[PDB]
Structure 1
């Protein structure tokens, strides 16, 4: 219903805050991130409810979308924070880790490097905040009819941002392609992430349902 520019403003206003973290072992480092993550998830839900077209979906669909996309969203949020910190990841203002410390957790050295590669790619493209919030909304809606019309609106919005940037048509859809292809790499990183979290001993749906309702 809305215009390409008020879509930007609405999403920007719905942006979650940057939370603070609470040598490392494997269990203490994953304790830090899990905590930050679970705190971060509360704010993600409130953000999702303010993404245009989300609350119009059934509760069953809202939960399902967040359930499959939550790690993707945390990761692209992490990458966005670490953009101006080459060779490092900004989990929190009080938790900036280089590649060296990432070996505290086994199997995390691979995922770590994939996040750093994404961060450099965003810097190479000089990703804007107006585009970032658009990419993040797409992730929430795509990873899981009405949804596609909303997704089609975000595409127009992204194009609108690139057209106002002074870009000709060729560089516009080229950049659009470049951006969306990164999401495939983000999905990949999430998949490898779920594995590791599954490779651990023992409520998201409960948290999702509790806060969404």
Structure 2
């Protein structure tokens, strides 16, 4: 974990990427929720396989692994959502067969627009895939900490910087972009909080799930 170079870290994260799942082959509030709920359920399974391939995660106790996934699972789904929705302005790509707009469930339009704004921010910054997988790993490891983990987090920070330095950015630009990316995570946390609020205002067996994976 702490032995990996920045390049080894990147390739390991890239190859550990979860597959793009499909929705079940007009919508109502109930039907829309059912599709999204089912999609998220099947995605959680792959998220666990991905998490167990994130450097330093399996080094943790099963107790800590459950706690980190329980806190970050919606954040991870959301950043995954806004990432694949980058090439679709004004639209969210939940699934290749499920591309929705603003007009496409009461109480969700606020978080929907927040996800759209985040996607536009990534597109404006021209977020790269190598940067995306680093941000996703950070979310997993940081969302539920409150010195092994912090050292792994520092390693991912070095990896991000390495990617920016290799891209030709000046050290000032490296620090600025790093700051810009990590501040977005605060907004992703915000969207998750509102999401966890609204959703639980069917798919929560991460403790159950992770244990049956063993």
Q: Look up the SS of the partner of 1:20 in the other structure.
A: coil
Q: Unaligned stretches of 5+ in structure 2?
A: none
Q: TM-score under structure 1 normalisation?
A: 0.96
TM-aligned CA deviation for residue 210 of structure 1: 1.9
Q: TM-score, normalised by structure 2?
A: 0.95
Displacement of 1:209 in angstroms is 2.3
Contact 2:138-2:156 at 8 Å conserved across structures: yes
Per the alignment, residue 207 of structure 2 pairs with 205
Is the Cα contact below 8 Å between 2:41 and 2:203 reproduced in 1? Answer: no
Q: Is the 8 A contact 2:69 2:206 kept in 1?
A: no
Root mean square deviation, CA, Å: 1.4
Does residue 41 in structure 1 map to residue 57 in structure 2? no
Residues 85/27 of structure 1: CA separation in 2 closer, same or farther (3 Å cut):
same
1:80-119 deviation line (CA, Å, top 9, x unaligned): 0100000000000000001111xxx111000000000000
Deviations 1:42-76 (A, max 9, x none): 00000000000000000000010001000000000
C-alpha deviation, 1:208, in angstroms: 2.5
CA distance in 2, matches of 1:169, 1:135: 20
Distance 1:19 1:201 in 2: 16
Q: How many residues align?
A: 209
1:200/1:141 Cα in 2 relative to 1: closer, same or farther (>3 Å)? Answer: closer
Q: CA deviation at 1:203?
A: 2.8
Deviations 1:180-204 (A, max 9, x none): 0000000000000001111199933
**Mapped partners of 1:70, 1:132: distance in 2:** 16
Cα deviations by residue, 1:114-161 (Å, 9 ceiling, x for unpaired): 000000000000000000000000000000110000000000000000
**Within 1, Cα distance between the matches of 2:200 and 2:112?**
17
Instruction: Name the SS of the counterpart of 1:96 in structure 2.
Output: strand
Q: Which moved more, 1:17-26 or 1:199-208?
A: 199-208
